[PDB]
Design a protein around this nucleic acid. Structure first.
Lengths: 106, 172, 136, 197, 191
RNA sequence: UUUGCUCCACACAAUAUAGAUGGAUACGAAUAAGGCGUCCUUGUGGCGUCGCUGAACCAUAGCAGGCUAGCAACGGUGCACUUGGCGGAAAGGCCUUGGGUGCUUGCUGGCGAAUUGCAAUGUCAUUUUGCGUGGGGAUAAAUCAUUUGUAUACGACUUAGA
RNA sequence: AGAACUGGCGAUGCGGGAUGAACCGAACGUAGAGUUAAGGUGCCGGAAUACACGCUCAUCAGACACCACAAAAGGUGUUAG
């Protein structure tokens, strides 16, 4: 193991825009390997922090704390609407966000 | 709802001083829930007579279950409907799986050819075919033989993953 | 001088054909075809499982390269007690055609403790390969 | 998971090949289609011809800067079809073009790596027993293709060179496979053949 | 009515058997060996008793149905085309003036150079496909031999060779010099 | 014009990010259809095996993978050279032979772990450029003015000029 | 063209039918979450290329009437009574 990771690299889709109404408060995380909503019940309730960096040293180097949480299921492909705290952008996202593999139900 | 089953609708009109025991009408209405079957009962029996329409009562509403679902033979149902270009008294002899599944497949064909309206589909007596001779269908008897082999192309490959070394194909 | 046809001969479906369910409530359970309905949805039948027949499309059931001698009739429990006469389930676990199914099924049932001490259970054979790659 | 996903053109379609790709290009996933000359369609060459009688407006119908909007060269260009499935008007598609490195025929050596396919991109899973066959090689030649005996020759040089490479590639791995059944008589296939290994 | 199978008993003698793989049929015969590609109908053969052929043809409710007969006729053309052959004895019935027809050789194509054709000084180099020998008159006046080993390589070119002297004004009754087919016989006289 | 610039090596500091946390893994062709192995008079061959998608192969055991020894060895993997080949669509790579160093958890010991107070996108990665030592290599152009006038509204291409 | 009653616009938004001051739903309080109908489920555009049962080969393809309506007389393209 030449790498340490306890999160899933699921491809993000988008955020909470709606028809012609805008209100970015809900994310659209899509985890690969899931085709049924019933298998999306393991991944419930965890810190997700979107990957980014800062500039000047204010904490150690380029670290600014963000937060998030996994919500209910969405769609049929096991799409997770893991809403963040308040830091919910809209800058054409969609990437392998860090999903946090429990805060173990069991 | 899910599937058009079969119910038992019996009428008695007004078994009182006026007409003591009329004729006791009873048919085999094919419908989904216990709501449509009631209206189709009055729709298939428009030959009722001047008494009262407000007396919409049922003698004993139940549920006529499917008689032997595994029993697969041949049946015939007279298709009747009134369109705008006239009418069509049709009659098919398609091999039915059960005894009520023919009605379900009837809505998948009659609405795919002459565009049969849902408020015009009539239901008559269901015939039964056991032996040959009377069978005027060739495509039915052809599919009913003994120890007959045949190849079948096309295959299902339902997936979403963008990774495959299988090199997808169709062989069954 | 002969005709001689190459191959491309798929497993023909007729009276008596053991199959397998991959999708549905009875997924993974063994099944078989006793009576043929038409040129569409075949009438499958699960032996040692206990499940009534139904209208299942060809997209939820595939044929298997195994044959046997049984008559035509839509009946299940009959094809279970007299299965000893035309046994084939023993070959199902003997042939290397259905071993790929249990390869990922049984592995998923394994715990983390039994899926971490396998590295030494694979190098005892690999060490004999490394010497037989250049020297042999 | 993987940074760049390369899709081969070994018997693929056009619009169907860019199905799930649209979900990837919006996410900024680099996907490149190789061998544009190897493109088949489950249709016909018959209908596919009239691509000039109804193909022009709204620019400057004769200019060289603000005139027509592309659509020229062997029908128009397989590159134009991939744009229509991506939000080009937004920067969600502007940056996608930088990721979508699809040129023509042979691109940078990306086909010499991964050739994964899309379940709904090939015509093999979408062909009726009786449907005609379509050839882009004859479609491009129909409207006077330049490098006809040149491109086909360059492709042939790679097929032969790969045949000599696959010969020795299947050689050293054969000794491993042969020693995979004769070396299982020890303590390896006597306790792992009941768990999945 | 969507037929399941339409098998046809094809009588194939020994010595001229064919090779069956995918959709390609091999023509085996002492008199020339040619091939044929079939990628538009999708057929499949099956051996069960050498001579006869019993297969299964689906799709019987459009234009397919009996797509074996349309192939069986083509099979016989490859069997009787390599054994019996197809000698189209065409006779040149024409008066007017003695046309000097001289067939020259060029790159193994044998372009028919027609000199002075009813007053015409145009050299019509009609392309001739390989697999058929063309001679002249020996004992019978005005006779050309079209003995070939195929159908789409002999009869196909013969149709273009006949309609190569099409005139805008003149047609057929202007002069009785029209090239018509006398009898579509075969090479073998006994067969 | 206050001895600078380029290549290899890269002290101490900035400007970044369209989302890094095993790994972008080369046969071609066909779908009323194939691949691999064996055999053979080398073909449109036969036999056997595989297929029901990547839930398969490779890779993984030490402080963010630390400091030693012995056994099992003459393999496998990585950095820095040399010899022998190949490549013309954005070629900018791959493989093999001949040495040395570190490592090499199949099996079998010892030491090290913490005090950080149950986690805090908890860093050992990189687009470009400039400013301090110097081990090699290489000793430059255009525009304005004037002259010639194929060119010429103000410009540009074609001028002459140690 | 001329009457009685008349869900809107006129004097009223947001969502949606590509697009629409006239249709449907909804007679407008300020956030979040959940639940219908109309309108949908490849991208553009917040959504499953999810399943079963039919049919077709058009060098004028087709995918919402009102909203710049087409009819009768034919034909060797096909399926089901």
């Amino acid at each position: 193991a030449e790498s340490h990771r306890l999160y899933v690299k699921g491809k993000h889709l988008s955020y909470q825009r709606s028809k012609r109404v805008n209100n970015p408060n809900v994310s659209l995380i899509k985890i690969e390997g899931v085709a049924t909503p019933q298998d999306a019940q393991f991944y419930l309730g965890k810190r997700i922090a979107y990957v980014y960096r800062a500039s000047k040293e204010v904490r150690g180097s380029k670290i600014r704390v963000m937060w998030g949480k996994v919500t209910r299921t969405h769609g049929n492909s096991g799409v997770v609407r893991a809403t963040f705290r308040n830091n919910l952008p809209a800058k054409t996202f969609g990437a392998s966000v860090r999903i946090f593999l429990y805060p173990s139900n069991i | 709802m899910a599937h058009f089953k079969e119910y038992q609708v019996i009428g008695r009109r007004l078994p009182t001083e006026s007409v003591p025991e009329p004729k006791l009408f009873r048919m085999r209405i094919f419908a989904s829930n216990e709501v449509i079957a009631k209206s189709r009962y009055w729709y298939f029996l428009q030959k009722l007579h001047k008494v009262k329409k407000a007396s919409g009562e049922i003698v004993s509403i139940n549920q006529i279950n499917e008689a032997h679902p595994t029993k697969v033979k041949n049946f015939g149902v007279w298709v009747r409907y009134d369109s705008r270009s006239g009418t069509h008294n049709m009659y098919k002899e398609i091999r039915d799986v059960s005894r009520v599944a023919a009605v379900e497949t009837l809505y998948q064909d009659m609405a795919a050819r002459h565009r049969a309206r849902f408020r015009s589909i009539h239901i008559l007596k269901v015939a039964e075919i056991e032996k040959t001779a009377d069978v005027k269908r060739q495509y039915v008897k052809q599919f009913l033989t003994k120890d007959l082999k045949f190849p079948l192309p096309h295959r299902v490959q339902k997936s979403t993953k963008t990774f495959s070394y299988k090199r997808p194909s169709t062989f069954y | 001088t002969d005709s001689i046809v190459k191959a491309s001969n798929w497993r023909l479906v007729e009276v008596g054909r053991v199959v397998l369910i991959k999708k549905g409530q009875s997924a993974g359970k063994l099944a078989a075809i006793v009576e043929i309905i038409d040129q569409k949805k075949v009438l499958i039948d699960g032996p040692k499982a206990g499940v009534p027949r139904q209208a299942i499309n060809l997209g939820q059931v595939v044929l298997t390269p195994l044959t046997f001698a049984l008559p035509r009739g839509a009946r299940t429990a009959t094809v279970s007690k007299k299965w000893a006469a035309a046994a084939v389930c023993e070959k199902w676990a003997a042939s290397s055609w259905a071993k790929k199914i249990a390869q990922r099924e049984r592995r998923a049932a394994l715990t983390d403790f039994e899926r971490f001490q396998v590295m030494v259970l694979r190098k005892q054979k690999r060490y004999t390969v490394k010497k037989a790659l250049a020297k042999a | 998971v993987e940074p760049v996903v390369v899709i081969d053109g070994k018997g693929h379609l056009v619009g169907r090949l860019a199905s799930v790709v649209a979900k990837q290009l919006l996410n900024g996933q680099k996907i490149v289609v190789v061998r544009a000359e190897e493109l088949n369609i489950s249709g016909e060459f018959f209908r596919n011809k009239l691509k000039y009688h109804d193909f022009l407006r709204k620019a400057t119908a004769f200019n060289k800067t603000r005139g027509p909007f592309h659509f020229r060269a062997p029908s128009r260009i397989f590159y134009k079809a991939l744009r229509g499935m991506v939000s080009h008007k937004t920067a969600r598609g502007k940056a996608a073009l930088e990721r979508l490195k699809v040129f023509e025929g042979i691109p940078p050596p990306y086909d010499k790596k991964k050739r994964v396919v899309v379940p709904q991109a090939l015509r093999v899973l979408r062909l009726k027993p009786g449907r005609k066959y379509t050839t882009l090689g004859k479609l491009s030649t129909s409207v006077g293709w330049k490098y006809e005996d040149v491109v086909a020759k360059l492709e042939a040089k790679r097929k032969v060179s790969s045949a000599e490479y696959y010969a020795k590639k299947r050689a050293f791995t054969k000794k491993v496979a042969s020693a995979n059944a004769t070396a299982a008589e020890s303590d390896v296939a006597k306790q792992l053949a009941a768990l999945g290994y | 009515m969507k037929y399941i199978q339409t098998e046809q008993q094809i009588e194939v003698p020994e010595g001229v058997t064919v090779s069956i793989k995918s959709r390609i049929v091999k023509v085996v015969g002492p008199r020339g060996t040619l091939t044929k590609n079939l990628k538009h109908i999708d057929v499949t053969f099956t051996k069960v008793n050498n001579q006869l052929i019993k297969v299964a043809v689906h799709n019987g409710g459009r234009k397919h149905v009996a797509a074996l007969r349309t192939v069986k006729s083509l099979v016989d053309n490859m069997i009787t085309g390599v054994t019996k052959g197809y000698k189209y004895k065409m006779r040149y019935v024409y008066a007017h003036f003695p046309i000097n027809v001289n067939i020259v050789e060029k790159d193994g194509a044998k372009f028919i150079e027609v000199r002075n054709f009813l007053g015409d000084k145009k050299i019509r180099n009609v392309p001739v496909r390989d697999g058929v020998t063309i001679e002249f008159s020996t004992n019978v006046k005005d006779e050309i031999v079209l003995s070939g080993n195929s159908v789409e390589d002999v009869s196909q070119n013969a149709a273009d060779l006949q309609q190569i002297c099409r005139v805008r004004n003149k047609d057929i009754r202007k002069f009785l010099d029209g090239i018509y087919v006398s009898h579509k016989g075969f090479i073998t006289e006994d067969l």
